[PDB]
Amino acid sequence: SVVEATWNDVQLEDSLGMEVGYRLIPMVDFQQDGELLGRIRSIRKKFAQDMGFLPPVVHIRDNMDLQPARYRILMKGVEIGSGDAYPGRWLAINPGTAAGTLPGEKTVDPAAGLDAIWIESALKEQAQIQGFTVVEASTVVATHLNHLIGQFSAELFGRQEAQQLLDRVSQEMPKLTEDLVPGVVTLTTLHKVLQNLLAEKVPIRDMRTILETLAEHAPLQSDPHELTAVVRVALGRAITQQWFPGNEEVQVIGLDTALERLLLQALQGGGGLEPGLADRLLAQTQEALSRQEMLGAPPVLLVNHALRPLLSRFLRRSLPQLVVLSNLELSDNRHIRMTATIGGK
């Protein structure tokens, strides 16, 4: 090379990044328009004012070993999603109800997982009236990105993001903060709690309710896996109204009164569960889920309080569509009806 090297030649890994084929560089060009960059901002905005923290920047760059109209979405250096995005064209998607067909590359939407087909421009107004849904090129990339963050929000919420939130809270209710961390709770413990809250789709905007609940229970309990379940009940009204809006009936999944005992036997049994029970659970749990998908009911499981923190820890790694709540996280002012049962069939 022409110029000598300096430590600025060291490329530290990026929390969130994107690699882009040379056909997309125009839509990701700082210098030119930047059609996509405007959408990544309004995603990262509508994520702070929604999920309660600021997603890390999306470091975008070109990698010419990629197909010209293909992108990789990266997390801490490793791929978490790829896709194609042809510029001048448009994407049309069937929400399962459209009528007809169109000429173009048949494909699958990276977001909802739906069947879709890229189309040309002038089919725009014609594709919609056939029942389709049409979004621009750059918008596909964005919707694929806004979907990869809400799925990986737990891992994007690093220790740096927790202090930056501890600092943001501490400029509006600083008294809660001045003597909580590192005083009563260590930042190691705060982050892991907020991280567990995120990993189960529970938002952390109510840092008042959280930093209050912590400083109350923190001295006589320092296990974040137990502090968490305490903070969940303080957010019981927010977790409730998140999946069961209004004050109408609560359509829940339920487990057997004795299977509970079967499961409750396994709790104090030690630090683990026994094999044969597992493969049965996943099957019947997905059985109950399937009935819900046809009743129009949410995929919410409702269990004994001491049965949540491991059913979630177990069932969610296989069916991350599922929600595992407790009877202490639901408000007292709601009627409950077990729309489906995990039983011996």
Select from 72, 88, 117, 91 the least CA-distant residue to 26.
Answer: 88
Same-domain status, 280 and 243? yes
State the burial class of residue 344 (Cβ atoms within 10 Å of its Cβ: 0-12, 13-18, 19+). exposed
What is the domain count for the chain? Answer: 2
CA distance 324 to 312: 5
Q: What are phi and psi of 131, to 5 degrees?
A: 105, 5
Q: Do the domain assignments include residue 9?
A: no
Tell me if 149 sits within 8 A of 55, measured CB to CB. Answer: yes
Closest CA to 72 of 152, 123, 141, 7: 141
What six digits make up the tokens of 267?
A: 């709790």
- In this structure, what token pair is assigned to residue 125? 């107004």
Residue 64 in tokens: 């010419």
CB neighbourhood size of 274 (10 A): 10
Residues 147 and 177 both lie in one domain: no
- DSSP assignment letter at 314: H
Same domain for 24 and 69, yes or no, is yes
Q: How far apart are CA 108 and CA 94, in angstroms?
A: 10
Angle at 156 between CA 161 and CA 27, to 5 degrees: 110
- Way it was determined: X-ray
Do 109 and 184 sit in the same domain of this protein? no
Separation of alpha carbons 76 and 84, rounded Å = 21
In a domain, residue 3? The reply is: no
Residues 140 and 163 in one domain: no
Whole-angstrom distance, CA of residue 164 vs CA of residue 214: 18
Element (H, E) at 279: helix 275-295
Could you give the count of Cα atoms lying within 13 Å of 216 in the half-sphere of its Cβ? 10
Q: CATH no. for residue 131?
A: 3.40.30.60
Tokens 């999306």 locate to 58
Are 166 and 198 spatial neighbours (Cβ–Cβ below 8 Å)? no
227 class by beta-carbon count within 10 Å (0-12 exposed, 13-18 middle, 19+ buried): buried
Separation of alpha carbons 140 and 142, rounded Å = 5
3-state secondary structure (DSSP) of residue 187:
helix
| Whole-angstrom distance, CA of residue 126 vs CA of residue 196 | 46
Cα 140 from chain centroid (whole Å): 18
Answer yes or no: do 200 and 236 share one domain: yes
Q: In which domain, by residue range, is 45 found?
A: 14-157
Q: DSSP E strands: which ranges in the chain?
A: 16-20, 58-62, 70-75, 78-84, 90-93, 106-108, 115-119, 133-135, 250-255, 300-303, 323-326, 336-342
| H or E stretch covering 203 | none
Q: Which of 157, 181, 212 is the last residue of a domain?
A: 157
* Pick from 51, 56, 22: nearest CA to 40: 56
Tell whether 221 and 139 lie within a shared domain: no
Q: Checking phi first, is residue 343 left (phi over 0); if not, alpha (psi -120 to 50) or beta?
A: beta
Whether residue 84 contacts residue 70, with contact meaning beta carbons closer than 8 Å, is answered with yes
User: What's the Cα-to-Cα distance from 34 to each of 66, 90, 147, 292, rounded to whole Å?
Assistant: 20, 17, 21, 43
What's 83's DSSP letter? E
Q: 342 and 255 in contact (C-beta within 8 Å)?
A: yes
- 164 and 147 assigned to the same domain: no
Closest by CA position to 96, among listed 110, 111, 116:
116
Q: How far apart are CA 227 and CA 214, in angstroms?
A: 7
CA angle 95, 93, 100 (to 5 degrees): 85
DSSP state of 13: P
Residues 314, 336 contacting (CB under 8 angstroms)? no
Peptide bond into 87 cis (omega under 30): no
Residues 94/115, Cβ–Cβ less than 8 Å: yes
Residue 63 near residue 17, CB atoms below 8 Å:
no
Helix or strand or coil: residue 342?
strand
Instruction: With beta carbons less than 8 A apart as the criterion, state whether 337 and 297 touch.
Output: no
Q: Which of 209, 311, 345 is nearest to 300 (CA)?
A: 311
Q: Specify the amino acid at residue 250.
A: V
Alpha-carbon gap, residue 67 to 86, rounded angstroms: 11
Specify if 2 maps to a domain.
no
User: CB-hemisphere CA count at 13 Å for 33?
Assistant: 8
- SS3 percent helix, strand, coil of the chain, rounded to 5, is 45, 15, 35
